[PDB]
Scaffold this active site. Structure first.
Site, mmCIF file in Angstrom:
data_model
loop_
_atom_site.group_PDB
_atom_site.id
_atom_site.type_symbol
_atom_site.label_atom_id
_atom_site.label_comp_id
_atom_site.label_asym_id
_atom_site.label_seq_id
_atom_site.Cartn_x
_atom_site.Cartn_y
_atom_site.Cartn_z
ATOM 1 C CB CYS A 12 16.699 -28.172 20.235
ATOM 2 S SG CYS A 12 16.458 -27.855 21.985
ATOM 3 C CG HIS A 41 21.122 -24.674 31.661
ATOM 4 N ND1 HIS A 41 21.787 -25.881 31.669
ATOM 5 C CD2 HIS A 41 20.333 -24.672 32.761
ATOM 6 C CE1 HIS A 41 21.412 -26.580 32.724
ATOM 7 N NE2 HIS A 41 20.530 -25.870 33.403
ATOM 8 C CB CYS A 96 13.722 -32.522 26.221
ATOM 9 S SG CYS A 96 13.818 -33.033 24.489
ATOM 10 C CG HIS A 124 24.245 -30.692 33.136
ATOM 11 N ND1 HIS A 124 22.935 -31.010 32.855
ATOM 12 C CD2 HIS A 124 24.571 -29.671 32.310
ATOM 13 C CE1 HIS A 124 22.487 -30.215 31.900
ATOM 14 N NE2 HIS A 124 23.460 -29.392 31.552
ATOM 15 C CD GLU A 126 20.663 -34.764 29.816
ATOM 16 O OE1 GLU A 126 20.892 -35.845 29.236
ATOM 17 O OE2 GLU A 126 20.703 -33.662 29.234
ATOM 18 C CB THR A 167 20.689 -35.032 25.608
ATOM 19 O OG1 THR A 167 20.608 -33.887 26.470
ATOM 20 C CG2 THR A 167 19.729 -36.107 26.104
ATOM 21 C CG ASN A 227 23.361 -26.879 23.813
ATOM 22 O OD1 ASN A 227 23.521 -26.129 22.847
ATOM 23 N ND2 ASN A 227 22.487 -26.623 24.777
ATOM 24 C CB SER A 269 19.035 -22.905 25.806
ATOM 25 O OG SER A 269 20.427 -22.734 26.021
HETATM 26 S S1 F3S Z 1 17.639 -33.652 24.375
HETATM 27 FE FE1 F3S Z 1 15.865 -32.173 24.127
HETATM 28 S S2 F3S Z 1 15.602 -29.980 24.713
HETATM 29 FE FE2 F3S Z 1 17.186 -29.672 23.101
HETATM 30 S S3 F3S Z 1 19.440 -30.162 22.936
HETATM 31 FE FE3 F3S Z 1 18.448 -32.189 22.841
HETATM 32 S S4 F3S Z 1 16.447 -31.614 22.079
#
Ligand code: F3S
Ligand code: F3S
Lengths: 309, 309
Positions: A12, A41, A96, A124, A126, A167, A227, A269
């Site tokens: 991403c 991760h 991010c 977690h 975050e 997220t 995710n 990731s």
């Molecule tokens: S919040 Fe940011 S780092 Fe990747 S999975 Fe979503 S874009």
């Protein structure tokens, strides 16, 4: 055996930026470069960066004065941020932007003394960082993970309440939680939908389409990737056999023996190189040419800080 | 005379993408390339592209069959989009993602037969395109430009009401309009704040800082640039003489005669070269080295569609 590739999949915008921040810091200033918590991760990425000189630590206190420090893509609390600021350290924030966005709203609520509810998974990083943006004793910051948690939650002033979310949550399950929140707290305020990022929404959408055609779904990602787990969970819930794997080596022959259609995807990731080897392994196990599914185009990019280009 | 430069200023991610879409189309398919409405609201960019083979039209009935058509960054209505789809044309969409995001919400409300209110300026292409996303007679799509408009608006069912905003509005003025909306329609739903994009918010914040130091503010941008006008307006409201200019040629000596500090900024659609020439002219008029003010570093980038790489 047909090999299908989900789309979108893998990296991403936030992860690409975070990784490049570490790589560039290493290239520009050399090793060692200190990173607080796994930058992303993914075992493969973390191992590669460590092999290049990156040192992953748990507490800022472990970092020597004069060193370079990078915050992971998952974000950090204000306490962590303020501590690093006071220290004799050069700090590069790889959080991010899509997480920082949520942070700002939580700090806003804390400022006004109004309570906030975060939909997320306890433990977690975050969640730690986001709830770590609230510090007003008069208000309050609560964590809920399911409709059940909402049903049992009690607050001080339901008239001034807002919510935020992690997220990388399940789009489906979060919808359930939000529905419970509004039923229980009719005046609660939040975004138009939630804080689930575009990448999470898109990858779950893509795996949904993949699962519709594949008997088996392989999700390239690490065990601690929120995710990534959600992608494997979605496929499994759709009645397909799903496996979360770090790399091609984890693939067992029995998993795909006699399987006619196998689908492959990757968490936000996981590097593309890992997917390529998964495909290669499946091919030596009978798979043909990998066929990419048509999917939502993503065009978002987050540049690394100017100092690190 | 000291010359200060606002930070950030100039090109936003959507404008840079939109221009690149037209440039790439011209390179790939050659001239001519039709574009519905000025790709971005900047005379310099438009004149140059027009000279390169781009033809700017307002209605699809102006475009010949078999031609290539590109929607401007401002977006278009569903009516225009479908008229383009029915016609024999190859279409590309340069609509900024941050405008599309709003479109999708208006479309949702339309499908639900539920009313929506847009905060924006009548006649602007973005407003026409956004309101053009609503097409359900049972509901409604209303435009409000000020608190006064709110105070006189009546809707069918205020229990099912939501709002959206133009991406380039005055941050301060929009706040006033929203305050009025919630006071008159307590059940109205919207985003956490508004739909004003990061670029507009940042450039206004930057000009606010610039104006606190400069006696005169020059804003590089065309007359029809909504976000550009907001920048000059903000400075003027702070008691500083501010001028919206397309290039160095528009600068009149009297504006900076005997002025100790002059500030310069640029709207989201103004090329940096224009700013450089403005600085050059101010230096001819007695100004020294241009000094960039410290500011929020932007890192968002929107990629061109794969079909136009
Ligand atoms: S919040 Fe940011 S780092 Fe990747 S999975 Fe979503 S874009
Ligand atoms: S909505 Fe899009 S094109 Fe520029 S000023 Fe805002 S980013």
């Amino acid at each position: 055996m047909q090999i299908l590739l989900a789309n979108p999949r893998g990296f991403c915008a936030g992860v690409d930026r975070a990784i490049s921040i570490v790589e560039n810091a290493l290239a520009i200033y050399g090793a060692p470069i200190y990173v607080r918590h796994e930058v992303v991760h993914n075992r493969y990425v973390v191992d590669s960066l460590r092999e290049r000189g990156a040192i992953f630590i748990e507490q800022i206190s472990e970092v020597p004065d004069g060193a370079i420090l990078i915050f992971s893509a998952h974000g950090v609390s204000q306490a962590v941020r303020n501590e690093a600021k006071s220290r004799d350290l050069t700090v590069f924030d790889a959080t991010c932007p899509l997480v920082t966005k949520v942070h700002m709203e939580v700090a806003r609520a804390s400022r006004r003394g109004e309570e906030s509810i975060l939909i997320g998974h306890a433990g977690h990083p975050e969640v730690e960082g986001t709830m770590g943006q609230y510090s007003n004793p008069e208000g309050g910051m609560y964590l809920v993970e399911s409709p059940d948690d909402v049903w049992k939650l009690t607050v001080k002033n339901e008239e001034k309440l807002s919510f935020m979310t992690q997220t990388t949550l399940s789009v489906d399950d979060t919808s359930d939680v939000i529905d419970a929140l509004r039923k229980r707290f009719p005046k609660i305020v939040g975004p138009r939908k939630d804080d689930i990022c575009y990448a999470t929404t898109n990858r779950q959408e893509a795996v949904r389409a993949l699962a519709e055609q594949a008997e088996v779904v392989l999700v390239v990602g690490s065990k601690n990737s929120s995710n990534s787990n959600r992608l494997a969970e979605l496929a499994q819930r759709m009645g397909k056999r799903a496996f979360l794997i770090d790399d091609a080596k984890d693939i067992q022959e029995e998993w795909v023996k006699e399987v006619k259609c196998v689908g492959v995807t990757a968490g936000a990731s996981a590097p593309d190189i890992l997917v390529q080897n998964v495909v290669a392994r499946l091919q030596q196990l009978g798979g043909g040419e990998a066929i990419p599914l048509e999917g939502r185009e993503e065009n978002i990019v987050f540049e690394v800080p100017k100092e690190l280009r």
